[PDB]
Amino acid sequence: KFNDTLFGEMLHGYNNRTQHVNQGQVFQMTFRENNFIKDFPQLADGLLVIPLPVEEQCRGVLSEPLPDLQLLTGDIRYDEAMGYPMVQQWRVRSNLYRVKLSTITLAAGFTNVLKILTKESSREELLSFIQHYGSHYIAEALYGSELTCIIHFPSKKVQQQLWLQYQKETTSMPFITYLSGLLTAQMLSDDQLISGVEIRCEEKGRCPSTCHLCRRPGKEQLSPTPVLLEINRVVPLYTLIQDNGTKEAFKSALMSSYWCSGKGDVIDDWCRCDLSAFDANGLPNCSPLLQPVLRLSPTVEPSSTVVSLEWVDVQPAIGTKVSDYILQHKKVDTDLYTGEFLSFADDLLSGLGTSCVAAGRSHGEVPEVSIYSVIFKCLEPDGLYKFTLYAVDTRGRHSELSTVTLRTACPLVDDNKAEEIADKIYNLYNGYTSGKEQQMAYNTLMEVSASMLFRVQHHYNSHYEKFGDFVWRSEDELGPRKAHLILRRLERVSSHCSSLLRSAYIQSRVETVPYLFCRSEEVRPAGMVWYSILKDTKITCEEKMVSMARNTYGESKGR
Ligand SMILES: *[C@@H]1O[C@H](CO)[C@@H](O[C@@H]2O[C@H](CO)[C@@H](O[C@@H]3O[C@H](CO[C@H]4O[C@H](CO[C@H]5O[C@H](CO)[C@@H](O)[C@H](O)[C@@H]5O[C@H]5O[C@H](CO)[C@@H](O)[C@H](O)[C@@H]5O)[C@@H](O)[C@H](O[C@H]5O[C@H](CO)[C@@H](O)[C@H](O)[C@@H]5O[C@H]5O[C@H](CO)[C@@H](O)[C@H](O)[C@@H]5O)[C@@H]4O)[C@@H](O)[C@H](O[C@H]4O[C@H](CO)[C@@H](O)[C@H](O)[C@@H]4O[C@H]4O[C@H](CO)[C@@H](O)[C@H](O)[C@@H]4O)[C@@H]3O)[C@H](O)[C@H]2NC(C)=O)[C@H](O)[C@H]1NC(C)=O
Numbered sequence: 001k002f003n004d005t006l007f008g009e010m011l012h013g014y015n016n017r018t019q020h021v022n023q024g025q026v027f028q029m030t031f032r033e034n035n036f037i038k039d040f041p042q043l044a045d046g047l048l049v050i051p052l053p054v055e056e057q058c059r060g061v062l063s064e065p066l067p068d069l070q071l072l073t074g075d076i077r078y079d080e081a082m083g084y085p086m087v088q089q090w091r092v093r094s095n096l097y098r099v100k101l102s103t104i105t106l107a108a109g110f111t112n113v114l115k116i117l118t119k120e121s122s123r124e125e126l127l128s129f130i131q132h133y134g135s136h137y138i139a140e141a142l143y144g145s146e147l148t149c150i151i152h153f154p155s156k157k158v159q160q161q162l163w164l165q166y167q168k169e170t171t172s173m174p175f176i177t178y179l180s181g182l183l184t185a186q187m188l189s190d191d192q193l194i195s196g197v198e199i200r201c202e203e204k205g206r207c208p209s210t211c212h213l214c215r216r217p218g219k220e221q222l223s224p225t226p227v228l229l230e231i232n233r234v235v236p237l238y239t240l241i242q243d244n245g246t247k248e249a250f251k252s253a254l255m256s257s258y259w260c261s262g263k264g265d266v267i268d269d270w271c272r273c274d275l276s277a278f279d280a281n282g283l284p285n286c287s288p289l290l291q292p293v294l295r296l297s298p299t300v301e302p303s304s305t306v307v308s309l310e311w312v313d314v315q316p317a318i319g320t321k322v323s324d325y326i327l328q329h330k331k332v333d334t335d336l337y338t339g340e341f342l343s344f345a346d347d348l349l350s351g352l353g354t355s356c357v358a359a360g361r362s363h364g365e366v367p368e369v370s371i372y373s374v375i376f377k378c379l380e381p382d383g384l385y386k387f388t389l390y391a392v393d394t395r396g397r398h399s400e401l402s403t404v405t406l407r408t409a410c411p412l413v414d415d416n417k418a419e420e421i422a423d424k425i426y427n428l429y430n431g432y433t434s435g436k437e438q439q440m441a442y443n444t445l446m447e448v449s450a451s452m453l454f455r456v457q458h459h460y461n462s463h464y465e466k467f468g469d470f471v472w473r474s475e476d477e478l479g480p481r482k483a484h485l486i487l488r489r490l491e492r493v494s495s496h497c498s499s500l501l502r503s504a505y506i507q508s509r510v511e512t513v514p515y516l517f518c519r520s521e522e523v524r525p526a527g528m529v530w531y532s533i534l535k536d537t538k539i540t541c542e543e544k545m546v547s548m549a550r551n552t553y554g555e556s557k558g559r
C-alpha cells in the first residue's frame with residue numbers, strides 16, 4: 001500500500017525530468033520521536049517543520065503589467081487601436097511552513113532493491129529503478145496555501161486608466177478586489193472602461209479563515225492542511241548508494257535517462273546514441289531537438305510595414321547542438337505555399353540583407369539561454385503574413401515547425417487632409433459645370449491611397465449625405481466608370497481598417513524603439529555531414545532604432 005502522511009512528499013523521492021513527486025519511498029516514516037505542530041497529527045520522524053515569520057504570512061504581491069505572452073505565439077490577433085492584451089499577476093501566500101529533513105534512515109524496500117542492484121551493473125535495470133524511485137530526494141521545501149490570480153486586461157491603456165482610477169478612489173483595498181467589485185456590480189450597468197477585464201484564479205491549498213487577502217466568498221476554511229508550493233533543494237539519489245563502484249555506474253544511467261532519452265550514453269558535451277536510436281534519415285535521435293516557439297516581440301507592437309519576432313534557443317546544456325534556425329515568411333490572401341527562405345546563420349548574419357531584415361542574439365532570462373530575434377522593416381500595410389520557424393541541429397535534423405500569423409497595421413491617414421479633400425470634392429460637385437472640375441476631382445480621389453479614399457468617403461458622408469451619398473453623387477457628376485473605379489479602390493481596404501477608419505478621429509503618434517543588429521565576424525568551419533554550432537559563432541551586436549508611425553483611433557481626442 002501507499003504510505004501517505006503530511007510533509008509528506010519529502011520521504012518519497014523526486015524526478016527532475018518529469019517533475020513528479022511521490023516516486024517510490026526513499027526514506028522510512030516512523031513515529032517514535034514525538035513531533036507535533038498545531039492541529040495537525042503526529043509528524044513523521046526526522047523532518048523539521050519551521051513556520052515562516054509573521055511578515056511572510058498572509059502577504060500579497062501585485063506584479064507589474066506585461067503583455068500576455070500566450071497571445072503572441074500562434075495566430076496573433078488583437079485590436080490595432082487597443083494594442084497587446086495585458087496580464088497582471090496577484091499572488092497571496094498564507095499558511096507557510098519551511099520543511100527540511102534531517103536526519104532520517106533509509107527505507108526498507110529502498111535498501112532491498114539497492115542491495116541487489118549494486119552488484120548487477122545493468123543499463124535496462126538501472127532505468128527501471130529511476131522510473132520507480134525517481135532521480136532525487138527533496139531536501140528543502142516550502143508548504144502552505146497560495147492563491148495565484150491573473151487579471152486579463154484588453155489593452156495597456158485600459159489598465160493604466162483603471163490603475164489611476166483605482167489610485168484616486170483609494171487615496172485600504174487591494175487592486176484586484178477593487179476590480180472584482182466593479183466586475184460583479186456591472187450586472188447593474190453595461191459598457192464602460194471595465195468592459196473586457198477578466199480575472200482567473202488558481203489555488204494551491206485552501207485559504208485559511210484568518211487571512212483576509214486570499215478570502216474568496218465560499219471557499220474559506222478553518223486551519224487548512226498545507227500543500228507543497230516550492231521545492232527549494234534536491235539531492236541526487238546516488239548520494240545514498242554508499243559505495244564508489246555503483247554510484248558512478250548509477251550516475252551515468254541517470255544522465256542517459258535525462259539528456260539522451262534513455263537511448264544513449266553521455267560523453268562530455270554530447271550524447272553517443274546507441275543504434276538504432278537514429279531516425280528515418282539515419283541521424284542521431286536520442287537527444288531531443290525541441291520545437292522553437294516563435295513569438296512576437298513583447299516590447300515592440302507591430303506597425304504597418306514592420307514586424308519584429310523572438311524565440312528562445314532550444315539547445316540543451318548537454319546533447320543536441322543547434323547549427324541553424326530556418327525562418328520562412330509569406331504574405332497570404334494560397335496556403336501550403338513556400339515563401340522567402342532565410343537561414344539565420346547564412347542569410348541574416350552573413351549576407352546583406354539589410355535594410356529590410358535584421359537579426360540579433362541576446363542573453364535571456366537566466367544565462368545561458370539565448371534569445372534570438374529578427375525584425376522585418378519593409379513589409380506591406382494591412383497585410384496578413386505567415387512566419388514559420390524551425391531549428392537545424394549539428395547533424396542535420398529538423399525540429400518540429402512553429403508558426404506565427406499576424407497582420408500589419410492599417411496605413412497612416414492624415415485625417416485633416418481627408419476632411420479637406422472631402423470639402424474640396426463637395427464644392428466641385430456643387431460647381432457642376434466644368435470638365436476641369438470633373439477631371440481634377442477624379443484625379444485627386446485616385447492619386448491618394450485607398451485608405452485615404454475610404455476616409456474622405458467617411459468625411460463626405462458625415463457632412464453632405466442629405467444632398468447625395470459620396471458614391472451616388474460621384475456617379476452623377478463624374479460618370480460611372482470613374483465612379484466604379486473610385487468604388488473598386490475602396491474595396492482594396494480591408495474592413496478592420498474600414499472599421500477603424502470609420503472612427504471619429506485618427507491621429508498619428510510616432511514611436512521610436514531599439515532593436516539589436518548583429519553580424520557574423522567569423523565564418524565557421526563546416527563539414528559535409530556535420531556543421532558548426534550556431535551559438536559559438538562570434539558576432540558583433542549593435543543597437544539601432546526604428547521609428548514606427550501609428551494611427552491613433554478614438555471617439556474623442558482625450559486619448
Ligand atoms: C535535473 O537533473 C540533473 C541532476 O544532476 C541535472 O543535470 C545537470 O545539469 C547541469 C546544468 O546543465 C549540468 O552541468 C552542466 O554540464 C555541462 C556539461 O559539462 C560536461 O562537459 C563539458 C564539456 O567540456 C568541453 O570542453 C572541455 C575543455 O575544457 C573538453 O575537455 C571536453 O572534451 C568538452 O568539449 C569537447 O569534447 C570533445 C573533445 O574531447 C568533442 O566532441 C568536442 O570538441 C567537445 O566540444 C565539461 O566542461 C565538463 O567537465 C566538468 O566535469 C569534469 C568531470 O566530469 C571535470 O574534469 C571538469 O574539470 C569539469 O568540471 C569543472 O568545470 C565545469 C565547467 O567550468 C564546472 O561546471 C564544474 O563544476 C567544475 O568546476 C563536463 O564534463 C557544462 O557545459 C555546464 O557548464 C556550463 O554551464 C554552467 C552553468 O551551470 C556554467 O557555470 C559554465 O561556465 C558553462 O557555461 C559555459 O558553457 C556553456 C555551454 O557552451 C555556454 O552556454 C556558456 O555561455 C558558457 O560558455 C554545466 O556544468 C550537469 O552536468 C548535469 N548533471 C547530470 C548528472 O546530468 C538537471 O540540470 C536538473 N534540472 C534542473 C535542476 O532543472
Ligand SMILES: O=P(O)(O)O[C@@H]1[C@H](O)[C@H](O)[C@@H](OP(=O)(O)O)[C@H](OP(=O)(O)O)[C@H]1O
Pocket residue numbers: 270395527530
Ligand atoms: O572537432 P571538429 O574539428 O570540429 O570536427 C568533428 C568531426 O566533424 C566529427 O566527425 C564530429 O563527430 P561525428 O561526425 O562522429 O558525429 C564532431 O562532432 P562532435 O564532437 O560534437 O560529435 C566534430 O566536432
Ligand SMILES: *[C@@H]1O[C@H](CO)[C@@H](O)[C@H](O)[C@H]1NC(C)=O
Pocket residue numbers: 001002003025028029107108109
Ligand atoms: C510503508 O512503511 C513501512 C514501514 O513501517 C515500510 O516497511 C513499507 O515498505 C512502506 N511501504 C512502501 C510501499 O514502501
